[PDB]
Amino acid sequence: FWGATWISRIDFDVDFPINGLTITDESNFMNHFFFTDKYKPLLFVDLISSNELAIIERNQKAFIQPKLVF
Amino acid sequence: GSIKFWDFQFATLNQSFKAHDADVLCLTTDTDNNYVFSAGVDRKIFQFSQNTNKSQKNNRWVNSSNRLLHGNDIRAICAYQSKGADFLVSGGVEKTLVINSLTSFSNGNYRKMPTVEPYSKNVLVNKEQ
Amino acid sequence: VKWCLIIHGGYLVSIPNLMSTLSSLHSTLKRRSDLLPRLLALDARLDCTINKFKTL
Amino acid sequence: CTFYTSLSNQNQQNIFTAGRRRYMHSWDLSQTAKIEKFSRLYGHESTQRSFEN
Amino acid sequence: MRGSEYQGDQEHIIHNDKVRSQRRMRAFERNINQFKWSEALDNAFVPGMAKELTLTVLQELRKRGKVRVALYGRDESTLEPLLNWCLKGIEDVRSASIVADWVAVVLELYGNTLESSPVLQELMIDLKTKVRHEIHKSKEAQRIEGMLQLLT
Amino acid sequence: FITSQSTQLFQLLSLVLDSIGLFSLEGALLENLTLYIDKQVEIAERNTELWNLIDTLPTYTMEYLDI
Amino acid sequence: WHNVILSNISSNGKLLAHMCKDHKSISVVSLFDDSVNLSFPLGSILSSQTQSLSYNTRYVSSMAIDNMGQQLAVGFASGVISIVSLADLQIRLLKWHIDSVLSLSFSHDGSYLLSGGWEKVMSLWQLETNSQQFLPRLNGIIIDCQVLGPQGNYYSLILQMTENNSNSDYQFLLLNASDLTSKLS
Amino acid sequence: QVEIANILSSHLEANSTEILDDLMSGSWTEPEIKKFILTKINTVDHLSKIFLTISKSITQNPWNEENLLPLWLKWLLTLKSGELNSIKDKHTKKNCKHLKSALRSSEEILPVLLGIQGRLEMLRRQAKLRED
RNA sequence: UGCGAAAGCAGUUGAAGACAAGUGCUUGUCGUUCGUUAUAAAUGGCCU
Numbered sequence: 001f002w003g004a005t006w007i008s009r010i011d012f013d014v015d016f017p018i019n020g021l022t023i024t025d026e027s028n029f030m031n032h033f034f035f036t037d038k039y040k041p042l043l044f045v046d047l048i049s050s051n052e053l054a055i056i057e058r059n060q061k062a063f064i065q066p067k068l069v070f
Numbered sequence: 071g072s073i074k075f076w077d078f079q080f081a082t083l084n085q086s087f088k089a090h091d092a093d094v095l096c097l098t099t100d101t102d103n104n105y106v107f108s109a110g111v112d113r114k115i116f117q118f119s120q121n122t123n124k125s126q127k128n129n130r131w132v133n134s135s136n137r138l139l140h141g142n143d144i145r146a147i148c149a150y151q152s153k154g155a156d157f158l159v160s161g162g163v164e165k166t167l168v169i170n171s172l173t174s175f176s177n178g179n180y181r182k183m184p185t186v187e188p189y190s191k192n193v194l195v196n197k198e199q
Numbered sequence: 200v201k202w203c204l205i206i207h208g209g210y211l212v213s214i215p216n217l218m219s220t221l222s223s224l225h226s227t228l229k230r231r232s233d234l235l236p237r238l239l240a241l242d243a244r245l246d247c248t249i250n251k252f253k254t255l
Numbered sequence: 256c257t258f259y260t261s262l263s264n265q266n267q268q269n270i271f272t273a274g275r276r277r278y279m280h281s282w283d284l285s286q287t288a289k290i291e292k293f294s295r296l297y298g299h300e301s302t303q304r305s306f307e308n
Numbered sequence: 309m310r311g312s313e314y315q316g317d318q319e320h321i322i323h324n325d326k327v328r329s330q331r332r333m334r335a336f337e338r339n340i341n342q343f344k345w346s347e348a349l350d351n352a353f354v355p356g357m358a359k360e361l362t363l364t365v366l367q368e369l370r371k372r373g374k375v376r377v378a379l380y381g382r383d384e385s386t387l388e389p390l391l392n393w394c395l396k397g398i399e400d401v402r403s404a405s406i407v408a409d410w411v412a413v414v415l416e417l418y419g420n421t422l423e424s425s426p427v428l429q430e431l432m433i434d435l436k437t438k439v440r441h442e443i444h445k446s447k448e449a450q451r452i453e454g455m456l457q458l459l460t
Numbered sequence: 461f462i463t464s465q466s467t468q469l470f471q472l473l474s475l476v477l478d479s480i481g482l483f484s485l486e487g488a489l490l491e492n493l494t495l496y497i498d499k500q501v502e503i504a505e506r507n508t509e510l511w512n513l514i515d516t517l518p519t520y521t522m523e524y525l526d527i
Numbered sequence: 528w529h530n531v532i533l534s535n536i537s538s539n540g541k542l543l544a545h546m547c548k549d550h551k552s553i554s555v556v557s558l559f560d561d562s563v564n565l566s567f568p569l570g571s572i573l574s575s576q577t578q579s580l581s582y583n584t585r586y587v588s589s590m591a592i593d594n595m596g597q598q599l600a601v602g603f604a605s606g607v608i609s610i611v612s613l614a615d616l617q618i619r620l621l622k623w624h625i626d627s628v629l630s631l632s633f634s635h636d637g638s639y640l641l642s643g644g645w646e647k648v649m650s651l652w653q654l655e656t657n658s659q660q661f662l663p664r665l666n667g668i669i670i671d672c673q674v675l676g677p678q679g680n681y682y683s684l685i686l687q688m689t690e691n692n693s694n695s696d697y698q699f700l701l702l703n704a705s706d707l708t709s710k711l712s
Numbered sequence: 713q714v715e716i717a718n719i720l721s722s723h724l725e726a727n728s729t730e731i732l733d734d735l736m737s738g739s740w741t742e743p744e745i746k747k748f749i750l751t752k753i754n755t756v757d758h759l760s761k762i763f764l765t766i767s768k769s770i771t772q773n774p775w776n777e778e779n780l781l782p783l784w785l786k787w788l789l790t791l792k793s794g795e796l797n798s799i800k801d802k803h804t805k806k807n808c809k810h811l812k813s814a815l816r817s818s819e820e821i822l823p824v825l826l827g828i829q830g831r832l833e834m835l836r837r838q839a840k841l842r843e844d
Numbered sequence: 845u846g847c848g849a850a851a852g853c854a855g856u857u858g859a860a861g862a863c864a865a866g867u868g869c870u871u872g873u874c875g876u877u878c879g880u881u882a883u884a885a886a887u888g889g890c891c892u
Contacts, residue, residue, distance in 0.1 A: 004186070020171070020178070021169045021180070023154050043192065044195070054195050062113065062141060062163075063112050065112070065113060068889080088298070088656070122615060122617055134618075135619065176618070176620070177574045177576065177618075179575075201455075204455055205837050206841070208459055208482060209482075211459045212459055217459070221456075227449075231449030231450075232453055234404050235443070235822075237404070238446055239443065239505075240412075240512050242509070243508075244415055244416075244512070245436045245439060246509070247513060247516060248419060249432055249433065251419070251791070252422055254791070288321050291705045292892095293706070295660060295707070295892050296892080297891095298656065298659070298660070342890090450826040450827055451830030454828060455830045455834040458477070458831045466817075467820060467821040474828045482834075490835055494829075497825055497828055498829070500821075501826065507774055507782075508819045510770075510789075511816055511819055513786065513790070516789075532875050582873075583885095584886060586875075606888065620886075622887080622888050646889080648889090659891095662890090664890070707892090813852085816852090
C-alpha cells in the first residue's frame with residue numbers, strides 16, 4: 001500500500017498484536033509489517049520485477065520576505 | 071496593500087490600514103463578521119479583529135496579527151465555520167492548499183497539503199518490457 | 200634601486216642624513232613588507248582549497 | 256495664521272501659522288520667542304503634503 | 309506673490325530653523341543605512357565605481373561585522389564580481405589586506421560550490437597566481453630593506 | 461658555527477654582517493653563508509604554510525530498501 | 528502578594544499590575560478602590576509557538592498597565608510586545624524590536640504606546656492603525672519611558688550608555704513631545 | 713612502495729613504535745602520500761596515530777632538512793581536515809598546541825632571514841663588480 | 845580565570861534541588877542553592 005508520502009507492506013497471514021483541521025464528523029458521511037516515509041512525494045509506485053520496486057517522485061519568482069541572520 | 075473599511079449607508083471611509091507590502095488579492099470574513107482576513111502578493115495573511123465588546127460598540131477594527139505561511143502569492147482564500155468545523159483555506163501560486171483555524175488563527179496549528187495527491191494516477195509501469 | 204645601493208654604497212654611508220632624504224624609499228618598502236604575513240596566510244588558504252578540488 | 260487660547264487654562268495663549276510647506280509653526284505667548292515646529296504626521300505623510308489650509 | 313524677496317530687515321525678531329541641505333547620498337550608503345548588507349555589497353562592484361569608494365563599503369561592512377551576512381545568499385553568478393575586483397584589488401597595497409579577509413570567508417563559506425563550479429575555479433587559479441606574485445614583491449621589498457639597513 | 465630563540469642568534473648574525481661591513485667580507489665564505497640562509501628561508505616558508513593550515517539530486521538512483 | 532517577579536503602576540498611579548510564581552501568573556489590582564481585581568496565568572496570554580521555542584520567547588522583561596485597566600502590554604526578551612485586552616484576554620502582537628524590549632508605557636488616553644530597548648530608538652506605536660513613529664540615535668538604550676503631562680506635553684526617558692561596562696551610566700532625558708527635542712538632558 | 717605501504721598499515725594496526733621510521737623512508741613520493749592517505753586511512757584511530765607521531769616529530773625538530781615528514785603533515789591536513797577535527801582527544805589538542813607553537817616561531821624568523829638574504833645579495837654583487 | 849607584550853605561558857568549565865516533555869526510566873530547562881581564580885532563530889532593522 002502507498003499514499004502521497006508513505007509506503008507500507010502488510011502480510012495478511014499474520015495478525016497484528018492486539019495490545020483539529022478537519023470536521024469532527026459527529027454527523028454522518030451520507031444523509032511482517034513495513035512502513036516507510038523516506039520516499040516522498042510519490043507520483044506512483046509499483047513492482048517492475050519480484051525484487052525490483054519502482055518509486056516515482058517529483059523533483060517561479062516570489063515576493064522577497066527576508067530572514068534576519070546575525 | 072491597504073485594507074479599508076467603508077460605511078455602506080453613507081459610502082464613507084471608517085478605517086484605513088496599510089498592512090500588506092503589495093497587492094491584496096483576496097478577502098474573507100467569518101460568520102459573525104468578528105474577523106476579516108486578507109492575503110495577497112506578499113505571502114502573508116493578516117487578521118483584522120473586532121471581537122472585543124468595546125470594539126463592537128465603537129465599530130473599530132484592530133490589526134491583530136499576521137502569519138507567513140505561503141511560499142508564493144496567495145490568490146484565493148475562503149472561510150467555513152460550523153458546530154464541528156472552523157476552516158480558513160488558502161492557496162495560490164505555490165500550488166498547494168493551506169488550512170488554518172479561524173478562531174485560533176494566530177496560535178493554532180496549520181496543515182500544508184501535498185502538491186499532488188495521486189487519487190487519479192498519471193503514471194503506469196509495465197512489468198513486461 | 201638595487202644597483203644604486205650597490206655601486207654608490209660608499210657614498211651613501213658618508214652622508215649626514217639618510218632617513219630624511221630617503222624617507223620615500225623607507226615608507227614605500229615598509230608598506231610592502233608589512234603585508235607579507237597576511238599574504239602568506241591567503242596563500243595557504245588558497246593552496247589548501249585549490250588542492251582539494253584538483254584531487255577530486 | 257490664527258490665535259488660540261486653551262478653553263480650560265485661560266492663561267495659555269498660542270499662535271499657529273502655516274504655509275505651502277510640510278511643517279507648521281506654533282508660538283507660545285520678550286527677549287526671545289518660544290517657537291515649536293510641527294512636522295510629523297505619524298505614518299500619514301502621504302495624505303498631507305502641506306499645512307497651508 | 310510679492311513677499312518672497314523680503315529678508316526681515318525691519319522686523320523685531322528673526323527666526324531661522326531651516327536645516328542646511330546635505331549632499332545626496334550614494335546608493336551604497338543608502339543600503340548600509342537601511343541595513344541592506346547584501347545589496348550594499350552589490351553596489352560596490354558596479355561599472356564605473358571609484359576604487360577608493362569601493363574600498364569603503366567593504367571596510368564598512370567589515371566594521372559593522374557583516375561579512376558572512378553579506379555572502380550567504382550567493383552563487384557563482386553573483387560571486388564572480390567580488391572575485392574579479394579581488395583579482396585587481398590584491399595588487400594595491402591599500403586594499404590587499406581587506407581582500408584577504410573577504411577571500412578567506414568566501415572560501416570558508418563556499419568550499420562545496422567551488423568543486424562543482426568550473427568558472428569559479430579559474431578565478432582561484434589566477435588569483436593564486438597573483439597572490440604568489442605579490443608575495444615575491446613583498447619578499448623583495450624586505451630584501452631592499454635589509455641592504456638599506458646595512459648602508460646606515 | 462652558524463653554517464654548521466634561533467632568531468635571536470640569526471638577528472645577532474645580521475648585526476655582525478653590518479659590523480663586518482662591505483669591504484671586509486670574503487667571497488668564499490659568503491657563498492657558504494648564502495647557501496645556508498637560502499636553506500633557512502625555504503624551511504621558514506615551509507613552516508609558515510603549515511602554521512596557517514593548523515589555524516584553518518540525481519534524476520535516477522538505484523538503492524536497496526531496508527525492510 | 529508573594530513571590531513578585533515584576534511589577535508596574537499605571538500613569539494615574541491607581542492600578543498595580545504584577546507577576547508572581549504562584550509557571551507564572553499576572554494579576555491587576557486597583558489600589559484605592561475595589562473596582563478592579565483580575566488574575567490569570569501567563570500561559571493563557573503566551574502563544575503556542577512561543578511554547579515550542581526557546582525561553583527568551585516566554586520571559587517577560589517589561590510590563591505596562593493602562594489607566595483604565597482595559598489594556599496591558601507585556602514585553603518579551605525576544606523583542607515581541609503583546610497587548611492583552613483584560614475584558615476577554617484577547618492578544619495582539621506588535622513586533623519591531625529585534626532584541627529585548629526594556630521599557631513600555633501607555634499614553635494617558637491609551638491610544639499610543641511608548642516602547643524602547645537595545646535599539647537606542649524610541650518607538651511610538653499608534654495602536655489605532657498599528658503604525659509607529661521613531662526617535663532614533665538616542666544616546667543610550669532606553670531603560671524607562673513615561674508620558675509626563677496633563678496633555679502628554681513631555682516624555683521622560685532613562686538612557687543607559689551600555690558601552691561603559693565598568694559602571695552604569697544613567698542619563699535622564701526630558702523631550703518636548705511637540706517636536707521631540709530634548710527639553711532637558 | 714607497495715611493501716612500504718603494507719608494512720605501514722600493519723605497524724599501525726599493531727601499535728608499533730616503528731611507524732616513524734616507516735614514514736621517514738625515502739621511497740615515499742609526493743602522489744603516493746595522497747593515495748595512501750585517501751585509500752588506506754579509513755579509520756579514525758589510524759588517522760590519529762599518524763597525526764600524533766608526525767606532530768610529535770616535527771615539534772622536537774621543526775628545522776629538520778628532511779621535507780618528507782612535513783609533506784605528510786601538509787597533505788594529511790589538506791585531505792582529512794574534517795576527520796581530524798572530528799577527533800575530540802584532549803591530548804590531540806595539546807599536541808596541536810605544541811606543534812603550532814614550534815611552527816609559530818619559524819614564522820617570526822622569516823623577515824629577518826629575508827633581510828639578511830638581501831644584504832648578502834648586495835655583498836656578492838659588489839664582489840663581482842670589484843672582480844670586473 | 846591568573847600573569848604578561850600585543851605574542852603567548854599555566855589552569856578551569858563541578859554538585860544538589862525543582863520543573864517540563866517523552867516513555868519508575870530517558871532527555872532538556874532554571875527571574876533556585878552550594879562550590880572553583882574561573883550557536884541563534886515569534887518575518888522581527890533606525891522619523892520628519
